[PDB]
Design a protein around this nucleic acid. Structure first.
Ligand SMILES: [Cl-]
Length: 345
RNA sequence: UGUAUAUA
């Protein structure tokens, strides 16, 4: 009845405080208008006891509020930085159903707010439950964000079980790299995990490099290997793409990998790619010229002109200068050479 | 002329 009154004439009730909600916290937190009063009060109130008064109502009904369209924000407000005195109780209120909450679209946002704010003992206490559903959680539309959040906010030694799940079986990393949600977990792992953890992960990627490099999601995983992997990792990749420059460049997704190699690679990595592009075939035309005729590889050669040194750019100009006549007669070849005209003068 | 990344 208290909520029914407050919805009708809200401005006629501008004195309402959180201590007045009392046993109405459930109806308020699950209401569109009610949950905001709670949130606005929690943010604007300077009284620690008013905010603590409803907290036992929050703990008592946490299991019902975490995956509510509106209640999930009320629970999140008590995970904020100025509420550390309440973290341990709130985690215990939800700890046993974390395996469920990881897959729910509202409750997962609460688990992320927890991992973002709480201290390491409680973080490990939440990953304790994610351990039970980790493989299925990595691929979930909701759960992958909880695994991503753990990788960013928890020290590498306490997310080792996530890495060992990537190395669960021989095909796990391929399975994850080609999954629209598991591939995001692999990238976060490449960004934040220790070299002893990322070296076996990058090891599995190399064995099925071609498939992953041309997958609509795995190509992002390969691009993250180039940037965050070792210098030898970039060598094995650049040597791989250099010897198969035409195949990698003329496919929709692996063409982005060659672009990533040019933006990240050192001078001699650029030299391997430029050398392979200008390597004259005895019975045909240089690879860079065929690449300019392709729907995808033409963006790769302009990337070369934008990224290589002047002497390597010099090598490219002496290679395709005899070929502009036959190049202009291919689809979009006029716009391609026009973007390249600043290099042909 | 060519690719992704969840809440009122
Ligand atoms: Cl859902």
């Amino acid at each position: 009845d208290l909520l029914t009154r407050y919805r009708a004439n809200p401005a006629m009730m501008k004195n309402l405080k959180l201590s007045d909600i009392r046993g109405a916290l459930l109806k308020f937190a699950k209401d569109q208008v009610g949950s905001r009063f709670i949130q606005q009060e929690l943010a604007s109130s300077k009284d620690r006891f008013e905010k603590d008064s409803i907290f036992d109502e929050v703990v008592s009904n946490a299991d019902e509020l975490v995956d509510d369209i509106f209640g999930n924000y009320v629970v999140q407000k008590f995970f904020e930085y100025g509420e550390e005195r309440h973290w341990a109780r709130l985690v215990d209120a939800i700890i046993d159903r974390v395996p469920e909450y990881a897959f729910q679209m509202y409750a997962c946002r609460v688990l992320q707010k927890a991992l973002e704010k709480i201290n390491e003992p409680l973080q490990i206490k939440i990953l304790s439950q994610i351990r039970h559903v980790i493989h299925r959680c990595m691929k979930d539309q909701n759960g992958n964000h909880v695994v991503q959040k753990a990788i960013e906010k928890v020290s590498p030694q306490y997310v080792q079980f996530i890495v060992d799940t990537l190395l669960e079986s021989s095909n796990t990393i391929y399975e994850m790299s080609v999954d629209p949600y598991g591939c995001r977990v692999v990238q976060r792992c490449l960004e934040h995990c220790s070299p002893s953890q990322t070296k076996p992960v990058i090891g599995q990627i190399h064995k099925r490099f071609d498939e992953i490099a041309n997958n609509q999601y795995g190509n992002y995983v390969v691009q993250h290997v180039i940037e965050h992997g070792s210098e030898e990792d970039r060598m094995v990749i650049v040597t791989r793409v250099s010897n198969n420059l035409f195949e990698f460049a003329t496919h929709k997704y692996s063409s982005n990998v060659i672009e990533k190699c040019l933006e990240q690679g050192a001078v001699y990595h650029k030299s391997m790619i430029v050398g392979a592009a200008c390597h004259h075939q005895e019975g045909s035309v240089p690879i860079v010229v065929q690449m300019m005729k392709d729907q995808y590889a033409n963006y790769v050669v302009q990337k070369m002109f934008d990224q290589v040194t002047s002497e390597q750019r010099r090598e490219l100009i002496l290679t395709v200068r005899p070929h502009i006549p036959v190049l202009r007669q291919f689809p979009h070849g006029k716009h391609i050479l026009a973007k390249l005209e600043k290099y042909f003068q």
